[PDB]
Every structure is written in structure tokens, then in C-alpha cells.
Amino acid sequence: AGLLKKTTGLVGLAVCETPHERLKILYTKILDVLGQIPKNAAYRKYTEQITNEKLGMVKAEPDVKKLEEQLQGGQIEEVILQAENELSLARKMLRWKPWEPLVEEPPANQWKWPI
Amino acid sequence: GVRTSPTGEKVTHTGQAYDDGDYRRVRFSDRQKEVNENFAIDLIAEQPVSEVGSRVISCDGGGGALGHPRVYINLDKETKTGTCGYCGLQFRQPHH
Amino acid sequence: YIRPGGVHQDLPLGLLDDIYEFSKNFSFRIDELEEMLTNNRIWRNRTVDIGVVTAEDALNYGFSGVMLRGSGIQWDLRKTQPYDVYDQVEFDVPIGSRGDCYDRYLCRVEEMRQSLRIISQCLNKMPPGEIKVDDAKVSPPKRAEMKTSMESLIHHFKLYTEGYQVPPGATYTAIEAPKGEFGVYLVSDGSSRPYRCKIKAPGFAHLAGLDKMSKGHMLADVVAIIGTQDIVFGEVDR
Amino acid sequence: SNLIEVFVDGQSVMVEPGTTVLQACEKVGMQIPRFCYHERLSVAGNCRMCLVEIEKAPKVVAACAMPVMKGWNILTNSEKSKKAREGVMEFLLANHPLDCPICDQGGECDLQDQSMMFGSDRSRFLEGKRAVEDKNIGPLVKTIMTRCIQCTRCIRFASEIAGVDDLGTTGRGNDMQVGTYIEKMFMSELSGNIIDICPVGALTSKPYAFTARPWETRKTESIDVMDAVGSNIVVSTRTGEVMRILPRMHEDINEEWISDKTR
Amino acid sequence: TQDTQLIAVDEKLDITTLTGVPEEHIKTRKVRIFVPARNNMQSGVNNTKKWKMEFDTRERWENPLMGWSSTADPLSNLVLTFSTKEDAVAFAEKNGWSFDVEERKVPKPKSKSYGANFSWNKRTRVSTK
Amino acid sequence: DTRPTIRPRNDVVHKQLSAFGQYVAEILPKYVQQVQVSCFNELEIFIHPDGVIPVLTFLRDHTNAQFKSLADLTAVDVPTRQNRFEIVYNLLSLRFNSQIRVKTYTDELTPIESSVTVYKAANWYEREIWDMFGVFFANHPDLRRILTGYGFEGHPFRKDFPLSGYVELRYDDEVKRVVAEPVELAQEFRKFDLNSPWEAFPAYRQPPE
Amino acid sequence: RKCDPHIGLLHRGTEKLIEYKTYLQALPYFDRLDYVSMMCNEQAYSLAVEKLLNIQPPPR
Amino acid sequence: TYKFVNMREPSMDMKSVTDRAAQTLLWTELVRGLGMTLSYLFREPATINYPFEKGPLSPRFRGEHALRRYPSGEERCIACKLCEAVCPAQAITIEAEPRADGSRRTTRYDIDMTKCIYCGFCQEACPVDAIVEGPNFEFSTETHEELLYNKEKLLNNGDKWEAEIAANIQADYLYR
Amino acid sequence: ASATRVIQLLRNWASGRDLQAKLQLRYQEISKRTQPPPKLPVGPSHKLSNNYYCTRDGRREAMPPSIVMSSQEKKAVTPAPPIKRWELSKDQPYL
Amino acid sequence: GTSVKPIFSRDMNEAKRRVRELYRAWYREVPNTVHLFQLDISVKQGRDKVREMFMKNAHVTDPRVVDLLVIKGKMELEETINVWKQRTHIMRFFHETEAPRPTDFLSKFYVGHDP
Numbered sequence A: 001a002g003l004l005k006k007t008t009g010l011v012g013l014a015v016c017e018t019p020h021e022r023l024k025i026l027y028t029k030i031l032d033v034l035g036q037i038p039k040n041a042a043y044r045k046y047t048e049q050i051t052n053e054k055l056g057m058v059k060a061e062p063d064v065k066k067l068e069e070q071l072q073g074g075q076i077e078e079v080i081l082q083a084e085n086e087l088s089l090a091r092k093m094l095r096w097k098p099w100e101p102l103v104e105e106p107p108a109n110q111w112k113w114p115i
Numbered sequence B: 001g002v003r004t005s006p007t008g009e010k011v012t013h014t015g016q017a018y019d020d021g022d023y024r025r026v027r028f029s030d031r032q033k034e035v036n037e038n039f040a041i042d043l044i045a046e047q048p049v050s051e052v053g054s055r056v057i058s059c060d061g062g063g064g065a066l067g068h069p070r071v072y073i074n075l076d077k078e079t080k081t082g083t084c085g086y087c088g089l090q091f092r093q094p095h096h
Numbered sequence C: 001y002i003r004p005g006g007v008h009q010d011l012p013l014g015l016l017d018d019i020y021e022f023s024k025n026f027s028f029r030i031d032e033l034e035e036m037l038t039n040n041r042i043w044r045n046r047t048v049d050i051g052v053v054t055a056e057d058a059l060n061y062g063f064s065g066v067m068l069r070g071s072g073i074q075w076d077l078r079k080t081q082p083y084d085v086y087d088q089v090e091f092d093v094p095i096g097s098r099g100d101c102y103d104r105y106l107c108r109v110e111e112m113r114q115s116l117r118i119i120s121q122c123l124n125k126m127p128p129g130e131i132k133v134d135d136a137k138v139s140p141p142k143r144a145e146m147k148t149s150m151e152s153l154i155h156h157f158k159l160y161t162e163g164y165q166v167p168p169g170a171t172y173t174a175i176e177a178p179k180g181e182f183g184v185y186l187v188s189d190g191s192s193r194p195y196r197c198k199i200k201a202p203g204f205a206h207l208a209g210l211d212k213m214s215k216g217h218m219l220a221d222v223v224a225i226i227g228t229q230d231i232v233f234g235e236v237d238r
Numbered sequence D: 001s002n003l004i005e006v007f008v009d010g011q012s013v014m015v016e017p018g019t020t021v022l023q024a025c026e027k028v029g030m031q032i033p034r035f036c037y038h039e040r041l042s043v044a045g046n047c048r049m050c051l052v053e054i055e056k057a058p059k060v061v062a063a064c065a066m067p068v069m070k071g072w073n074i075l076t077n078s079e080k081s082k083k084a085r086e087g088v089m090e091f092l093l094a095n096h097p098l099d100c101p102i103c104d105q106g107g108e109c110d111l112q113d114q115s116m117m118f119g120s121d122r123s124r125f126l127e128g129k130r131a132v133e134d135k136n137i138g139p140l141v142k143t144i145m146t147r148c149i150q151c152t153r154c155i156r157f158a159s160e161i162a163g164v165d166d167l168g169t170t171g172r173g174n175d176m177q178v179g180t181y182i183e184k185m186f187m188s189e190l191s192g193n194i195i196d197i198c199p200v201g202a203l204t205s206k207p208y209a210f211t212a213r214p215w216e217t218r219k220t221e222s223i224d225v226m227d228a229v230g231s232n233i234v235v236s237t238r239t240g241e242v243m244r245i246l247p248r249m250h251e252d253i254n255e256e257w258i259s260d261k262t263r
Numbered sequence E: 001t002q003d004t005q006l007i008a009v010d011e012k013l014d015i016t017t018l019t020g021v022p023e024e025h026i027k028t029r030k031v032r033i034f035v036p037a038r039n040n041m042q043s044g045v046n047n048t049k050k051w052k053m054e055f056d057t058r059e060r061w062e063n064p065l066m067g068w069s070s071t072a073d074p075l076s077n078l079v080l081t082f083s084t085k086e087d088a089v090a091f092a093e094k095n096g097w098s099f100d101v102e103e104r105k106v107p108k109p110k111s112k113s114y115g116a117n118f119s120w121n122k123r124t125r126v127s128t129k
Numbered sequence F: 001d002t003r004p005t006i007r008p009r010n011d012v013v014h015k016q017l018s019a020f021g022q023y024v025a026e027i028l029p030k031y032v033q034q035v036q037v038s039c040f041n042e043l044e045i046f047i048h049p050d051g052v053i054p055v056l057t058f059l060r061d062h063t064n065a066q067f068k069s070l071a072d073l074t075a076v077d078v079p080t081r082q083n084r085f086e087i088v089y090n091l092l093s094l095r096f097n098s099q100i101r102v103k104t105y106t107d108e109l110t111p112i113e114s115s116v117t118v119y120k121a122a123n124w125y126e127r128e129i130w131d132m133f134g135v136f137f138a139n140h141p142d143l144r145r146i147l148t149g150y151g152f153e154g155h156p157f158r159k160d161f162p163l164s165g166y167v168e169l170r171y172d173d174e175v176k177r178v179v180a181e182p183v184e185l186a187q188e189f190r191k192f193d194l195n196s197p198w199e200a201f202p203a204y205r206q207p208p209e
Numbered sequence G: 001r002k003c004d005p006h007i008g009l010l011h012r013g014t015e016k017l018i019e020y021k022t023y024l025q026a027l028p029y030f031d032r033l034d035y036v037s038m039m040c041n042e043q044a045y046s047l048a049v050e051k052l053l054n055i056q057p058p059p060r
Numbered sequence H: 001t002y003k004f005v006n007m008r009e010p011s012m013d014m015k016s017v018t019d020r021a022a023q024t025l026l027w028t029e030l031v032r033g034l035g036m037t038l039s040y041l042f043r044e045p046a047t048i049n050y051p052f053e054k055g056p057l058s059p060r061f062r063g064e065h066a067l068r069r070y071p072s073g074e075e076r077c078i079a080c081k082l083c084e085a086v087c088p089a090q091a092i093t094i095e096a097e098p099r100a101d102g103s104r105r106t107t108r109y110d111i112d113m114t115k116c117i118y119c120g121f122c123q124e125a126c127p128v129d130a131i132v133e134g135p136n137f138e139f140s141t142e143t144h145e146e147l148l149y150n151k152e153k154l155l156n157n158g159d160k161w162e163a164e165i166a167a168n169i170q171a172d173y174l175y176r
Numbered sequence I: 001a002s003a004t005r006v007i008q009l010l011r012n013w014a015s016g017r018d019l020q021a022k023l024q025l026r027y028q029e030i031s032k033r034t035q036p037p038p039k040l041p042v043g044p045s046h047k048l049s050n051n052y053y054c055t056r057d058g059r060r061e062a063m064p065p066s067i068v069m070s071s072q073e074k075k076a077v078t079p080a081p082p083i084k085r086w087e088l089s090k091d092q093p094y095l
Numbered sequence J: 001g002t003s004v005k006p007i008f009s010r011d012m013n014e015a016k017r018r019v020r021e022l023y024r025a026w027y028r029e030v031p032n033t034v035h036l037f038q039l040d041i042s043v044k045q046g047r048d049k050v051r052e053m054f055m056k057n058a059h060v061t062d063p064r065v066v067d068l069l070v071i072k073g074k075m076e077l078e079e080t081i082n083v084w085k086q087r088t089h090i091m092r093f094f095h096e097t098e099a100p101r102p103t104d105f106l107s108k109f110y111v112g113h114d115p
């Protein structure tokens, strides 16, 4: 999709020559881990909405140069970064499962700090 | 205007006089005790008193901004002339 | 000099001229630094490749300000969060290459050149205004009006006995220190005194990265490993 | 019961009939700036600093004078109320002599504290000021009566409490002087208590006489010893000395004052 | 409602063993709790809202050189602030300190009547205003 | 500006900051007991000291938060409250140029799972928070002392530790070493009663109960 | 391979001393906080304090 | 706005390689480092000789304290006590009693000279600018006691450094 | 600064840069240590009229921090409009 | 409520177990710190001092606080095995400089009024 980016700027972040296909398969995995999560969870109702919108947005436009500002997420070499840990993020709250109500209300005078 | 002490021991304007029984006088041995040659208590003695013909005068200590806040003093009580506490000097009433 | 409610006193008559006389020749001096301390072959090798931090590693070590900027991270408190009048002055942050001792070294000297323009822009932009807020409850009244008006005297008295009372709450505000991200998280108890004023010390968080910063380097490099950073022992301790 | 319902900035509170607006807001706690009314003392409504404008009414009432009317919402933090409080504030301060660094009330002066909270930040005065001649009323109490704001708190303390049919307000206008006319002494066993009631440096304590300042005296809680009343007092301790003795509040034993001997 | 190994111990809190206070300044020192007494020079009341926790004063010897009030009591200057007394006494138990509490006096309600200053026979009539 | 002295307030950023409030509130309603925005347009969510890692990891990895910049973690000892200590973190978002603050409660004997896992920038931040305040952090690499004298006992930043201290140092010729002694001051810190006796700003007026 | 230092050779009261001083008296703490760049510290502390008071400084 | 500081492509022609090869072999950027050192040697040194000359100061300098007095001669110190409440080191110490006439002058004004930081706050605190900081900064000593000042030593400083601070404040009060 | 012209050429050539016109230390260009008296302006509220403190009462305008949820479909919203890529310095692209 | 959370020990026994292993580990270096510290103190003195401050806190009955103490002891020994602590730091416990203090009521009375 044009000249490969030899220097992405940020040191360490490599420049995968297959940014598009990596973005789609990654988004399938993040959509996968969003499969088992129940409907009522606010994680689903919010983050799949951005995911498929972005998954639909990356699929439509196949050129990297413009796609940097379609998703606005900087460069393509790091939009896979918060997405891949979003895949990780869904895995972490496959365990915490916090959509249940408060574990216990704070003490009566714990907050509200004029003293 | 500094007076002397029994051990010489020039007593300051405040009145600090080290008694002959105080062990806190070796600090002064082989050294000198600093007292101010000028005494604020009697520097007001020679300062002239001025008769101003009005009920209340405002003192500023002179120097315009450089001085003391413009506190007023009442020149009606004959007795002793009204003294501006800020300035230390005193204004007189010419007895009308 | 910098006090709450504006700077304490006004500039003397001619201080602006003195800045211009110095600033005129300053780039001439930093060039003298530049020639002998940058392209010197033995300065270059002792500053290139000698310790480097990648992007996410520096970001997750609490590095901030120049320390990220030399590692390629695009961020600067001056522009992203333009505190004070910073949104009216043009300057260029010195983002750099890989991010070794050399990389931030070029970033720092470039900051001085940019700081020279921030001086120059600010030097011919000085407006005919005041030095303190016109709220005597938080700013001591002018001495000329102090010895004339009672409200000044009372306000000066109370401000110089207990000071202004700050409304309760907490606030962490950081500015771009010339070393890193300098923030104070002071918490107000609704009194005339603070309650707890933990500092974000740029030296602190940047000393936190030393362990990873010195993976695999010689003992004589450690002093230079400190040198690319800024660790003032008076500041690291909170 | 007879408790009438009256609002306070919208907040409904039940109040006893006859309770004044200042006392009406006392239960929730507002303490509208005051200079003449005192709790254990009668009311005059002279300083007009307690003036707070009452809702849906184009008139500012005195918080110490008008008790209540059914459901009258007190607008404590009203802009008009702040205007009225600010207006009288620069009024009584206009002729006050600039004595704060030289006045003993410095650091515990009500006039100083009000000017910082419910006060302005400047003066607009461009004329002269009045000066009042001091009248020595004892080697136990001061007289800097040029600082008097004519709150008439003292003259009540003479008429009541101590029972002395004594010092009042002579003259009038800007020259309204609160004194004794003839140089009559003030001997009463409760004379020393005339010191705390005065909100300004007009009447300060002669024995203390500029020995220290309030923002440094470590206060301790102890009991009067000289008399068997066992009065509650607050002892001022600085640098290892005792400078002045302040009465406490205990209701039955001492109300708010003490004898001259223990002061 | 908490599965973080919910284990029950009575042990009225005694962090004193780890609070670091030396053994001298823990038992002999007395602790006093009450609310401020407003200085009758001042009609303000905001002080009398909180509960503060001071210690007992110790000896203050004069420094022979220039008359400093030298003190060897490290705790002579320590005033806390507590909303009520139950938390105040609670702080006295966790840092186990011989306490001495005192209930706060509250303004008794005075009956006020400006019309009483002008009565028909009542002594509340006042000859000056 | 008709009011060039008071700080002009901003409401547009106040709105999305409020919007992000219930956002994070709804995502993890197990721990966020209270979300609070300040008049300085600062966001402060109130969480429980068991789910700090979930809420911290979520904020770090969220594509709609990316608050990867850990500013500082600190404590504010409030002895009045049952949980006197209060561990507080500050986070910054590079992409969203915004700062949010997490606040938790904790007592002397309630450990907190170490935040090194989420923000390993803090490795030294616990080393001082357990130093100055004494709050122990659970499952931590090395909770060591790096901000006080070697062998110092206690936690000086608490409100029970006096500012003067408990140990004073002097060189003695008997032992040829700088040996400890109980503190003894030539002059004592004159405690100042600065707090005003009259009511301050009426806004933060605690209602009586 | 491992490099952890030991600091506190200049650990000082700072925050501990600050609580017993007022805001104005706390200003010198920041001036002496770091020993290299003084003015920029007062930039932070004044900005934080003026933020709490909701008072903006004059433009000059 | 941003500006790259390190990225650069070296030219790869024979002349360019020879330039870089010569630079490493025949040390030219090294010699340049020596080149402008000689320019520094053949330059005037900025060495101020002392006590013969003096690095410039300003009429606002803060140094040795000196309690002044009125032109009539009376002490300016009113025992207003404010300097303590602002002194952030709590160096000063003021205690006063009614004088023989009654005008309160402090019976003890002992600036612990090794305590203060020369704030200028005490100057900014005094409503009668009694306590000032004299332009003197050369008042070192050999015993820790001589640093510990008192009321008399302050007054002597005021009477010794009297013309200078009277002139300095005269030319600086307008800014204040 | 006072050196002869020949030696000035020596240091000029050894440095290659005009050290005469921009010599380091100060000379007869600084502002005179004596200066005219100043007349500092008045503040933004030094008005004797329509200037009640309530109109600028910036200390008490601070409200306790607002509450938007307490323990005691809508689209996802980002906390702040995300930043935009910075532009290369128009003055100079790279060093 | 009174059902408090455990740091590492749910009861006295496991806390007592931790007390044993730190206390047992405390003299594995005691006869060697003095050797490395160039100290003038016999090994027995170190042993009994480790003993006597164990009885100094041998009074509490909550598993958490005693657990905090053993880790505090676990926070103490390695500070002097690896020569981090200096001479005066461990000499501080060995109370020699401090002035001898009275103990009885009469001797308290004779010295000064410091109850």
C-alpha cells in the first residue's frame, strides 16, 4: 500500500508490512472475546460498537496513508497496540466480571471531604 | 544615653542588666557586650513639639509613603499633648 | 518571585533591555557549546547507543517531558495543555530518534534555541498591565495604599497573619518543568493552610526508570546514563 | 407543638415562635455577620451588619430584630444581602483609625475577620476621619475609644449583668462618644469582662498590654481557683509563661464571663 | 459480602505495637479530647465545630544563651481534628492512649425580645439603647 | 473580560468529563462507588480497595481511555475517617490530553495488591508510600525503605508522628560515631492558631446532623 | 545488570513541614525543592493554588 | 509544531564518502573542537578580582538584616508581630512590654540568622518597614553564636548600614 | 573587546564566527543602574464605583465538586476530543 | 465489621509460624555481622537483644499486626546482612550513649517534674 514506513518514529514499535490484514484478524479476535460476554454488560454494548464500526471502517478503505486519519489513531503501527491489549482487556474482565452491583458501599463518612 | 551597671556591664535601653551572680557572663569575658549607643526612650526627649491649630491632625511619620500609616490623633485633651503611637513624636495644641 | 495571584513585584526599568542584550549573544554561546560538545567524535560515541528506552517502555515508566520527547514520543505540556499564556507563543518541541544519550542531548539544546524564541516572542509582547490580581483577599495590597486605606491594612494584616483561605478540595496540576513533568497534588482542608502537598517530582519518576535504563552497560557508563536524564538529588526525594 | 415552619434558603426548618432570624439560622448554622447583638445580652440592632434581605420582599430586615413570620425564606447568601452587608461594612470602617498593627485585637479582632470573609478588598474614602479623646477608666482596662464602633455592647454590660448604672453614649452624630462624661471610675467586680464583649480594640486589657499576639498563645483549659464558683477559663501560655486569662462558656457556672480578680 | 478470606478477630485495634512511638511517650502521656472554646474576645464560632486531640504540656526550660523556651517533649505540638467523638475515641484506641474525653457544651436557647426592652412593669426594660 | 480577576470556567470540557464519568461507572459498576467531577474540570472516580487492578488495567488498555501516563500515587491521612489512609493515583492520557484521578480508602491492616502490574512506573512509589505513610502493598517486588534514615522506626508522614521527630543525631567522642539521642530542641515550633473563627465560604458548609 | 540506588541523603520534611505552614509560607519550599531550576517550581505551586481559588492572574 | 533533531541521511557519493573518510582519518571535527578553544584563550577573562571589584547587584538585594529607625531617631519596630506570622522559618522572635513612656518597642528581637532564608517576606510584612535586609552579604563568622542575632545587634546593623538602605528603599518603594 | 585587530582575526579565524560584534560579556550597552522613578499602573478592579466584591467574588464561586453518580442505547463517549497530529516546523523540517 | 482481612496469616498459628522463621533466621548472621561490621560486641549480646525486643511486642493478639511485625523484622535483617546499614544504625539499638534514666518515684522526683 505504498512505500513501507522504515521509521515510524516511536522507537521499538515495528512497522508490520501487513497492517490491514493484521487489523482485521485482530478485530475478529477482539470480537471473539466479546462473544461470550453477556448482552447486559456495558463492555459489550460500548466496545463492540466501536470495534465493528472500526472493523467496518478498516475493511472499507484499503490504503494506509488515509486510514491513519480515518481511525485518527495516530499511525497504523500503534492502532494495533491498544487493540491488541483491548483483546487482552476483554480477557482480564473475563475474570473480574464487574457488572454486578457494588461489592459493598463505602463507609458512611468515608468520602465528602470538608472536615 | 546609657547608664552603668555595678560590674560596668552597660545596661541596654530595654533594661537588661546581668546580675553579678549570673554565670551567663563568661560569654562576655574576653569579648564585649553590644548595646546601642542611641536610646529610643530619650531620643524623643529633644524632638521639638509642634503646635498645630486644629482638632485632629494626621501623622504620617514624614516621607510621604515612607513612614507609618496615616493614623489620626485628637488634639483636644489638654493634659499631656497627644502622641501618635506609630510615630512616637507628638503634636501640640496652641490652646486656640 | 512567582506568587499566587500573579508575580510579587514589577520588573525594574531596563530589565527588558538587559534580557535582549544577553539573548542577542546567547545563541552565539550555545554554538560554542554546540561545536565542541556535539560533533566531537568521542562525545558522539559516548552518547550514541549508550542506553535507550523504547516507546511503550518509557511511557509506562512514568517518563515525561523531554525524556519521552527524546525517545520519539509526541507529547509536550507546553502545547497539549497550554497553561498560563503558553497558547500565544510559537515554539517547536524537539522530538528525536531512537532515544539514547545523544538523542535527548540534541533535543535539549534545541529546546534552548526554542526557549530563545519564547523569550524573544515574550520580550516584545510585554503588555501594559499589572503584576498582581486585584483581589486583596488573596493578594497583599500595594504598600502605598497599605499605609493609607484601612481595607488594605486589615487585608495585609490578615493575609500576613493567617493568609487567604483556600476552598476545600484536591488538585493535581502539572507544568512542563525544564527537567520533566512537575506536578503538585495539594489537598485543601478549607483552611488557611494545606493538608497534604505531594509533589510529582520529575527527578523521581525519571529515576524510577534507571533499572531498565541501564540494562547491559559498563560501569563507567552509569554516570553518563544519569547524565542523559536529569537527577537532581534535591528534587528526587519528592 | 407551636413550632412555626420557616425556610432558610429554601431549606425548611422548624423554629420556636419569637426566635429571631439570627437565632432562626443558628440551628442550621449561618451566623450572619453581627457586631451589636450578643447571646447572653439584650438586642439593639445598631450595627446593621446582620441585615439580610428577606425573600419576595423589597426590604432588608435585621437578623437580630425581626423574629419570624410563617414560612419566610431567609436568603442568607443573597446578592442583595451581600450588598447590604458590604455597604455597612465600609461604613463603620470609614472612620476607624488605622491601628491594626498597633491594636491588641490584631489577630482576634471581629472587625478584622469580617473584613476578610464578608468584606471588600479596597477603600473608596477620600476625606478626613474622626478622632476620639481617650478617657482612662482604670489601670485594669484600656481606653482607645477612638476605635469604638458605637455598638453599645459595653453600655448594656454596665446596665445589666454588672448592674452599674454607668457609662453610656454621650454626644451624637459622628461625635457620638461611648463614655462616662465625667471621669468616673469603673470598679465593678465584673468590670474586667467588659474586655471580651468589645469587638474592637476600643477596650483592651491593661495588664496584658501588648505582651503577645493571639496567633501564638497556646490555649489550655483550666478552672478558676480563687473563688469557689470554679469558673471555666482558658489560660494563655506562650514560651513557658502565662499572659492573659479568658473566661469560658459553661452556662450555669459562669455563662460567658468571670470576675476581675481571676481575669 | 467480602470473600477476601473473611476471618473474625475481636482485638480492639492496637496498632501501637507498630506505630513506632517509643515506649516512654505512649503510656505516661495523657490524651485529651474536646471541642475548642471560642475566645470570648471574638463572637465567631467556626472553631467549635470539630474535635481536636492534644496532649499534656511538659516542662519548658529557658535556653541559657538567648532565652529560648527549649522543650524536649516531641509531642507538645500535635493537634488533630475529628468530626465527632466516637472516631476521636477510636483514634485513642488504635494508637492505645490514655484518653480523657469531654462532651461539648452547646448554646442554650435564649429568649430574645426587642420589645421587652420597653415593658410596662417587666425588669427587662432597659434605660438606654 | 468583564471579570478579569476570577478564573473563567469551562463547561464544554466539563460535559464530556462528566460524560466519561458515568461511562467508566457503567463499565465497571462493581467497584466505582462514586464518580465526581470538580469545578476545576478534574475527574475523580471513587473505587474499592480490592478491584484496583481491574479498574486500573481497564483504564490503561481501553481504546477509549488510554490513560497510560501514571503521574503519581499518594496518601492523604484523614484520622477522622474509619479508613484514615487514602491511596490516590493520578493518570494522564496522551491521546485525550486529560487527567483522571482514582481514590481508594484503606486502613493500616488492609493490604492493597501492588499496582506494579498495571503501572510498573510506580515501583518506587510504593517504596515511599509504605515509608512515609506505612500502608503496606500486597504482592510487591520489594517494599523497601528509600526515603528515611536507616533503621528509622515509624511512618513520619502520618498525623501521629510529630514534625520534630523522635531521634536526634550527635557525634560523640566516646564511641567515635554519630549516635542517636531523643530529640531536644533549643527552640520549639510555636504552634500558630491561624484558622479564622468566623464562617468561611458558605459553599462548602457541612449540614449539621 | 541490576541497578537500584539508595536515596534519602537529601530526604527532607517538605510535605511534612508544609502542613504546619500557610500557602504563602509554603512558597519557599518549592523554590528550594529542586536545587537547579527554581522559578519553574513556583510556576506549578502558584498555578495549583490559583486554580483552587478560581482567581485568574492579570494577563501581564 | 515539532522539529526532528537527529534524523539525517548521509550523502553516499564518492566525494561524500571521502569527506566522511577524511573526517574519521584526518580529524577535522576534532580539530574544530580545538579550533574555537584558542579563540577562548585569546579572549578577555571575566574574572572579577575581589574585594577590589564587585559583581553587580540591585537596589532590591536581600542580605544582612538591620532594624532601622525614624529620622527623629526613634525605633521603627512597633512590635506589630506580623513578621513572625509570615517568617516561614520562624527565625525571628518578638516579645514586647510597655515602655517607660508607654510606646511599645520589642524587648527582644532576635533573628536567628542561621535560620531565615532572606525571604523578603519580613520586609514585605512590616507595615513600617522596620526590619530590612541590608545589602551586606559579607558577614561570615567562626563561632555559631555570633550568627545568632539579637535586638541590639540588629539596631547596630541599622545604625551602621543606614545610608544605603535608606537610599535603596527610597529608589525602590515605588515598585513596592 | 580592546584587543588589536590582528589578534581579533586570529580568534575570528580559529572560530570562523563573528565573536567581535556578539562578544560574551557586558559593555556600554546595559541600562544605567540609575533609572527614572516608576509609576506602576492600577489593577483591573481599582474602580471607585460599581465594583462590589460580589461581582468578582471568585473565592466563593467555587462549588463543591459535582456528583454525577453515587451508590448511596447511548453511544460511547470519549473523555475529550482526541488530539491532532502536529505539523512539521514550517521554519525548518529537520536538524 | 469485626471480621477483618488477613495480610498473610488467617490466625495466630500461621503468624506464629512466620514469627518462628524470622526469629530463627535472625542469628544465622548475628555472629557474622559483628565480624563484618568490625564491631566490638560479643555474639551473645546480639542474640539476647534480638530476644528482648521480641518480648517488647510479645503482647498483641491479632494475626495481621503481628504479621506486619515479622515482615518489618523481615524488613530489617537484610538491611545489615548486605552492609547497607552502617555502624551507627545497628549501634542505635545497643543503647550506650543515652543518659541513664531514673526508674523509681523518688528518683523521678529528685531529677525533675516530668511525670
Ligand code: SF4
Binding pocket: C154, D096, D097, D098, D099, D100, D101, D103, D104, D105, D106, D107, D109, D110, D111, D112, D147, D199, D200, D201, D202
Ligand atoms: S480593633 Fe480596629 S485597629 Fe484593632 S485590629 Fe480591629 S480593626 Fe484593627
Ligand code: SF4
Binding pocket: D145, D147, D148, D149, D150, D151, D152, D153, D154, D155, D178, D197, D198, D199, D200, D202, D203
Ligand atoms: S467601647 Fe467597645 S463595647 Fe463599648 S460601644 Fe464601643 S465598641 Fe462597643
Ligand code: SF4
Binding pocket: H076, H077, H078, H079, H080, H081, H082, H083, H084, H094, H125, H126, H127, H128, H129, H130, H131
Ligand atoms: S519589625 Fe515590623 S513587623 Fe516585625 S514586629 Fe517590628 S514593627 Fe512589627
Ligand code: SF4
Binding pocket: H083, H086, H087, H088, H089, H090, H091, H092, H111, H115, H116, H117, H118, H119, H120, H121, H122, H123
Ligand atoms: S526575610 Fe528572613 S527573617 Fe525575614 S521573614 Fe523571611 S526568613 Fe524570616
Ligand code: FES
Binding pocket: D033, D034, D035, D036, D037, D044, D045, D046, D047, D048, D049, D050, D051, D062, D063, D064, D065
Ligand atoms: S446584630 Fe442585628 S444589627 Fe448588630
Ligand SMILES: [K+]
Binding pocket: D105, D194, D195, D196, D197, D198, D199, D200, D201, D202, D203, D204, E041
Ligand atoms: K475588646
Ligand SMILES: [Zn+2]
Binding pocket: B059, B060, B061, B068, B084, B085, B086, B087, B088, B089
Ligand atoms: Zn506618628
